[PDB]
Ligand binder design. Structure first.
Ligand code: ATP
Ligand code: ADP
Ligand code: ADP
Ligand code: MG
Ligand code: MG
Ligand code: ZN
Lengths: 595, 137, 359, 277
């Protein structure tokens, strides 16, 4: 029956929604889109706990400490507002500062039960999305009428209710037989996941802690295992902890879990989640203005890792790798690569690792690896596992996670043949093939690679040809688009200058650079032009028919590399077509790298 | 010494020394429960400080009011019987605590040769949880 | 460990530490305090003081991290008491792990990952390089260890992070640590007729990583032998247990626990920064050193076994900041640079035993 | 509950040793430990409960023995022995008197026997201001040609010492050399067990065939000898254990025969860091 407190809380939340007007127009926009586009959007809105606190502190604390009494009124108020303002029920999600209610699975104790919490962790295992039966519909042959029934369980609402275990109807009230209508029944999705403490925050040498989460309807497939997730939900207890009946066992307690209502994936270094930013009109105006200056490439290249001295060409190459080219697919089904790869060989104090870590820190999706750190299955994802459902399947590895991203390899020359043969396929076909007992599949691994290695004799020697100093298979070298050789030669003036630069350090910004690269990579797709065609033809002919000794061989991969660099420079320019200037820049850079 | 515990110490207070090797995860137990009978909606409460929920409805033995006697009968001659275990817990209005299990084993140095050591189980709760980690003496 | 430390100090402790800091003889008192039971090796002890103090870390706007720890290597003849220093440093530092190459019995040397015995999930099983985070690792027999450990340690000593990549886990850990390593020459004795590169038993490029190298030789000398013998028999007799220690504790020596607390206090409180005069002096010194090395190399037809790089410049910077810190001064003057350069010349520039260095 | 197995010696040729279960009550508990031969006087009776007779198959019954009396088929002293100790000590030549009394079943090897005496007695540890440790246990190494009674010497040391623990780098041994977390076959409980080094703290560890040892065992020996403490980080357990013990080892030269023309360092496969300790 109606309740006075319930009505008062409903009216108070209605006043809150009246004073704050953003959510009203958000709901109107959702309905407008769903009407116009018939894809359909769900009925859910996000509210600000900070605004709630500023408006009504008592109501704020009520939601925070006793959600079971304060949320359903708000949901009803939102539903009423939507149904009034239009020409399913709606749902709420919470953002803002949770204060002492932001915890981790280790610091989550019984004193938080029945309270709204926000946990952070790493998803360890997801469950299979199964439908749940809500309403059943039946048809009677003898009478030509349709009957129906409804079902519910304990986890569908916050407040406890008296169980009503209705049975599945097979007969009519009079004894007639019934026929089920699968097409007219109603089903809802359902999933369960587990969250664990992050590995970079849990104490070392101690076993981890974990907590279960239940998701329903439209929050059912928002994450994958191995992800960093922040979940805001209601910590709840269910059933009776062996109290009912004798149940002599006293070891077990009360089952607990979180009826999650908000899930957010978080980005982190060497993690499978791509970082994305929201672009404002101010950002777009600034980027578009900056596009028109001639030395844009120079300023952008210099912006990277300003703490390091020189290496201007290497910085340019890294920027080109970050921007990337374009990949082509033909109606036949053939695939043409569009990524770039970089290898650095140098003297043992040339900031190779510093640049590599900078790329790891700045790239939107990058994964870091060392020579012998990961071996065998860890790179190709060729591991096979199984659940208790009995089926075996695969769980992704380094390069598989690195799809559409970057892979940093440090101490490259320490690898082995068994995995260099594997990485050949990744660099060229951009694909991984697995054939084990009961598994025969093919996984996309479109990623770029940057690697560093040391010369055989400790220091690069000019008295010997490049082969004796590098000592890597020519087939492998052919796959790397760019190779650089860097040596430190003692010189009074250079040493002086590097000294002042380093002392200065020991006593365009990166976020804007990231926004720039995101927009450029997402929006612009240039095409080839006859001018560039001719320039690249001439340059490739000359390189293939010159006698100079080069640091790397020459194949058609070099021509494709010219194409990719020209396209990437055009992408930097944000022009819709490649140009003679871009072709010349690519040719100059490759010539410098080879000579 | 952990090897000298025997019958005479049952239910007494003892002092022991050892090394922690394993700590379980925190459990949940109830200290104040609010319960309701699912048939006649008779409510009550329980406080803990092996408690079990009532086996049968208490509204009969508890003659609260004169009108309660009438309410306990209706629809002609059918006697009122709520059934076995008619109570359900209301979780929105209950309080819980923390419980934990530990294992303690003799110092490996003094174990007799040729025999695996002896270990023992311990239970702690409330403010004695999350105080040590395995490997501590 | 770093997860159960204390970051609050009593007022009496703070006042006592301020009074001790104001002492002008604090440096000498600390040097005498480190391992009073060994004879000589004043430069080694001073290097250990600098190591325990540690430098100052910097975070740059672009994200580049300039580490602030110090790495020391002890090449030496057998039985020169170069292991007792390791053990004492372990015992005195607040967070320390002492281990040998190939790890310890049932304890790996680097971060290791395995499935949970119960839940079959990933978790860090151990590893000294991560257990000792924020502290000191005392590596003995540095010349015997596997290549994977070599690579992981090489990444740790500079980037202070360990990158993990496996079939179901990918993350970058934190391993802020200071490395004190001890190794023995091949053939059982250091030979003056061969380069230190040939005396060591691994890639000579590894020597480019450490900030200080101490090559200790066991020369034979009657009076030195007699003095050391007298010291050792005194220690065994126990007279040294009272003399020196129990008297110098009255003003001219520090208790081990008090020194530990003082190190923690200084670490948590102070973080010096250089001055332009020191900067210019350091730059001039570095340029002169590299000019001399280039002259000798161009004169010779071979490359030296002890190269000079920017790592050494940063090591000098870290050492001067370390010396400045223990006085709690928020700035370092050229008086600190003088001592830093003296220590550097004493320790690292024993490369004069290198052939193309001769000249 | 105890299990008694027939003594292997008495079994007639070609058959197997049988076994039975025994029940001990009250003060009869923890009177006999594994590895000793005992005589038990008790009552022989069925497991009359069994489980139940609804089981399929023949109606067979198990039997047990209820123990009434148990008997076995020392280093403490008194004033009478203490006065005799002092009297014997006051005599001259006591050192050689003792040395002549070691391993009487072996002929010669006076240097071996005196070294065993020294290592079996041991010195006194020292610690200056609690910041400079000096060990007091004496280590000996035996390096001899085949057929020299090194194993006999080690067995005598085991039989004579108060706390001696045996181990070997090859062959069957009741204990290994590395600490580990392992299941309990009967109680199904995880247990932390240290190596013979840890188990023999304040005692003596005997190692047979010292040169047939693998990487893990060599690392454990090196750690124990250098630091007298064994670290461990396994199954969420991070800790350190004391391993203050005296080591006696036996080995064989490379090729099975000593080459007197070369230094000892090149006659064995061990390495200086372990040899010097
Ligand atoms: N000097 C000796 N006096 C008496 N018996 C001896 C003597 N030397 C060896 N033996 C006996 O000869 C056999 C040699 O085997 P034993 O294992 O005891 O020798 P070992 O020197 O340890 O050699 P290894 O382990 O290489 O076989 C044993 O029976 C030992 O008792
Ligand atoms: N060109 C440079 N400019 C500024 N600093 C440099 C430069 N080259 C090297 N360094 C310094 O030298 C150190 C080299 O470390 P690392 O990157 O591990 O060496 P490498 O990359 O040669 O293996 C870095 O800490 C860096 O600060
Ligand atoms: N200068 C010294 N002063 C005092 N004791 C010394 C000295 N040099 C060596 N010792 C003695 O040598 C022992 C240390 O030997 P060890 O640690 O094996 O040498 P190393 O560390 O070079 O391997 C100690 O017991 C110590 O008393
Ligand atoms: Mg590097
Ligand atoms: Mg033998
Ligand atoms: Zn009832």
């Amino acid at each position: 029956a109606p309740d006075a407190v319930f009505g008062d809380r409903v009216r108070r939340f209605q006043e809150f929604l009246d004073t704050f007007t953003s959510y009203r127009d958000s709901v109107r926009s959702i309905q407008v889109y769903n009407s116009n586009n018939a894809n359909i959007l769900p009925h859910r809105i996000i509210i600000s706990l900070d605004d709630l606190r500023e408006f009504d502190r008592s109501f704020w604390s009520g939601i925070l400490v006793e959600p079971a009494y304060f949320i359903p009124p708000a949901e009803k108020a939102l539903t009423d507002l939507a149904d009034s303002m239009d020409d399913h029920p709606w749902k709420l999600s919470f953002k803002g500062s949770f204060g002492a209610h932001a915890l981790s699975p280790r610091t989550l104790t019984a004193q938080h039960l029945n309270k709204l919490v926000s946990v952070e962790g790493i998803v360890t295992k997801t469950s299979l999305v199964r439908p749940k039966l809500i309403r059943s519909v039946h048809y009677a042959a003898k009478t030509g009428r349709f009957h129906y029934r409804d079902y519910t369980d304990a986890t569908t609402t916050l407040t406890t209710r008296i169980p009503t275990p209705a049975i599945y109807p097979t007969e009519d009230t009079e004894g007639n037989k019934l026929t089920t209508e699968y097409g007219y029944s109603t089903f809802i999705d359902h999933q369960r996941i587990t969250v664990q403490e992050m590995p970079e925050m849990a104490p070392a040498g101690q076993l981890p802690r974990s907590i279960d989460v239940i998701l329903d309807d439209d929050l059912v497939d928002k994450t994958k295992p191995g992800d960093r997730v922040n979940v805001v939900g209601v910590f709840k207890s269910l059933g009776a902890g062996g109290m009912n009946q004798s149940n002599s066992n006293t070891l077990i307690g009360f089952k607990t879990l979180i009826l999650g209502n908000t899930v957010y994936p978080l980005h982190a270094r060497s993690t499978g989640v791509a970082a994305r930013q929201m672009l404002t009109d101010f950002d777009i105006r600034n980027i578009n203005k900056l596009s028109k200056k001639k030395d844009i490439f120079d300023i952008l290249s210099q912006s990277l890792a300003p703490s390091i001295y020189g290496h201007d060409h290497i910085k340019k190459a890294i920027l080109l790798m970050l921007m990337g080219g374009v990949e082509k697919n033909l109606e036949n089904g053939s695939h043409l690569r569009g990524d770039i790869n970089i290898l650095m060989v140098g003297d043992p104090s040339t900031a190779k690792s510093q640049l590599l870590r900078f790329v790891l820190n700045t790239a939107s999706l990058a994964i870091a690896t060392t020579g012998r750190g990961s071996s065998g299955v860890g790179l190709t994802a060729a591991v096979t596992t199984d659940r208790e459902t009995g089926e075996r399947r695969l769980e992704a590895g380094a390069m598989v996670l690195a799809d559409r991203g970057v892979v940093c390899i440090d101490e490259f020359d320490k690898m082995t043949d068994v995995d260099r043969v594997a990485i050949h396929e990744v660099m060229e076909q951009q694909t991984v093939t697995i054939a084990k007992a009961g598994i025969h599949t093919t996984l996309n691994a479109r990623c770029s690679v940057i690697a560093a290695a040391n010369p055989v004799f400790g220091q690069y020697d000019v008295n010997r040809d490049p082969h004796q100093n590098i000592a890597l298979p020519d087939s492998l070298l052919s796959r790397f688009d760019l190779l650089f050789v860097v040596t430190d030669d003692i010189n009074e003036i250079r040493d002086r200058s590097i000294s002042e630069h380093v002392l200065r350090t020991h006593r365009v910004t990166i976020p804007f650079l990231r926004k720039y690269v995101q927009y450029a990579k997402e929006r612009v797709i240039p095409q080839l032009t006859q001018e560039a065609i001719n320039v690249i033809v001439k340059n490739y002919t000359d390189l293939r028919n010159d006698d100079n000794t080069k640091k790397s061989p020459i194949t058609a991969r070099t021509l494709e590399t010219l194409i990719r660099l020209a396209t990437a420079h055009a992408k930097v320019r944000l022009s819709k077509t490649v140009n003679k200037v871009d072709a010349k820049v690519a040719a100059n850079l490759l010539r410098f790298a080879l000579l | 010494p952990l090897r000298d515990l025997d019958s005479e110490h049952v239910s007494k207070i003892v002092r022991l020394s050892g090394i922690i090797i394993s700590t379980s995860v925190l459990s949940s137990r109830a200290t104040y429960l609010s319960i309701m009978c699912r048939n006649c909606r008779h409510t009550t409460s329980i406080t803990i400080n092996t408690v079990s929920l009532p086996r049968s409805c208490l509204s009969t033995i508890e003659s609260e009011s004169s009108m309660a006697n009438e309410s306990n009968i209706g629809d002609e001659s059918t006697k009122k019987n709520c059934g076995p275990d008619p109570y359900i817990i209301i979780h929105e209005s209950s309080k819980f605590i923390d419980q934990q299990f530990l294992k303690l084993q003799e110092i490996p140095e003094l174990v007799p040769v040729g025999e695996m050591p002896r270990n023992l189980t311990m239970t702690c709760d409330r403010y004695l949880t999350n105080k040590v980690i395995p490997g501590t003496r | 460990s770093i997860w159960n430390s204390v970051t609050m100090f009593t007022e009496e402790e703070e006042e006592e530490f301020l009074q001790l800091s104001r002492n002008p003889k604090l440096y000498e008192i600390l040097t005498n305090s480190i391992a009073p039971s060994i004879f000589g090796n004043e430069d080694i002890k001073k290097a250990i003081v600098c190591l325990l103090m540690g430098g100052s870390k910097k975070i740059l706007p672009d994200g580049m991290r300039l580490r602030g720890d110090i790495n020391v290597l002890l090449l030496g003849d057998p039985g020169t008491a170069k292991s007792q220093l390791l053990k004492f440093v372990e015992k005195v530092s607040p967070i320390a792990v002492y281990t040998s190459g190939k790890g310890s019995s049932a304890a790996g040397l680097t971060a290791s990952v395995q499935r949970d015995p119960m839940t079959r999930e990933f978790y860090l099983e151990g590893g000294a390089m991560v257990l000792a985070d924020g502290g000191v690792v005392c590596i003995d027999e540095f010349d015997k260890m596997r290549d994977e450990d070599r690579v992981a340690i090489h990444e740790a000593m500079e980037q202070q992070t360990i990158s993990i990549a496996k079939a179901g886990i990918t993350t970058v850990l934190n391993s802020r640590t200071s490395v004190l390593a001890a190794a023995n020459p091949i053939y059982g004795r250091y030979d003056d007729l061969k380069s230190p590169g040939d005396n060591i038993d691994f890639q000579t490029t590894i020597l480019s990583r450490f900030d200080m190298i101490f090559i200790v030789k066991d020369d034979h000398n009657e009076e030195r032998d007699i003095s050391i013998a007298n010291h050792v028999i005194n220690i065994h007799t126990g007279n040294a247990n009272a003399m020196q220690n129990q008297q110098e504790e009255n003003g001219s020596e520090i208790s081990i626990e008090k020194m530990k607390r003082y190190i923690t206090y200084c670490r948590l409180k102070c973080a010096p920064r250089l001055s332009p005069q020191a900067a210019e002096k350091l730059s001039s010194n570095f340029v002169t050193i590299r000019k001399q090395l280039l002259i000798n190399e161009l004169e010779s037809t071979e490359r030296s076994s002890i190269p000079i790089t920017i790592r050494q410049l940063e090591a000098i910077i870290r050492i001067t900041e370390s010396l400045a810190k223990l006085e709690l001064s928020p700035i370092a003057q050229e008086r600190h640079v003088d001592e830093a350069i003296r220590l550097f010349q004493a320790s690292t520039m024993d490369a004069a035993s290198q052939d193309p260095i001769g000249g | 509950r105890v299990t008694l197995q027939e003594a292997p010696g008495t079994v007639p040729p070609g058959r197997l040793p049988r076994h039975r279960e025994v029940i001990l009550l009250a003060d009869l508990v923890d009177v006999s430990k594994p590895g000793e031969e005992v005589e038990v006087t008790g009552i022989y009776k069925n497991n009359y409960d069994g489980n139940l007779n609804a089981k399929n198959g023949f109606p067979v019954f198990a039997t047990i023995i209820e123990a009434n009396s148990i008997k076995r088929r020392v280093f403490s002293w008194t004033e009478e022995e203490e006065r005799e100790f002092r009297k014997i000590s006051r005599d001259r030549g006591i050192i050689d008197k003792i040395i002549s009394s070691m391993a009487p079943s072996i002929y010669g090897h006076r240097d071996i026997k005196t070294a065993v005496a020294c290592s079996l007695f041991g010195g006194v540890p020292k610690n200056v201001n609690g910041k400079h440790s000096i060990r007091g246990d004496i280590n000996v190494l035996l390096l001899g040609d085949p057929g020299t009674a090194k194993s006999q010497i080690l067995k005598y040391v085991e039989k004579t010492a108060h706390r001696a623990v045996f181990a070997t780098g090859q062959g069957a041994s009741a204990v290994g050399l590395t600490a580990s977390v392992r299941k309990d076959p009967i109680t199904k409980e995880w247990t932390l067990e240290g190596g013979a080094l840890v188990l023999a703290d304040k005692g003596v560890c005997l190692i047979d065939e010292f040169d047939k040892m693998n990487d893990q065992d060599r690392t454990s020996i090196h750690e124990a000898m250098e630091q007298q403490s064994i670290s461990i980080s396994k199954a969420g357990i991070v800790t350190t254990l004391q391993a203050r013990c005296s080591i006696i080892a036996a080995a064989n030269p490379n090729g099975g025969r000593y080459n007197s023309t070369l230094p000892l360092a090149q006659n064995v496969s061990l390495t200086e860091p372990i040899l010097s300790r």
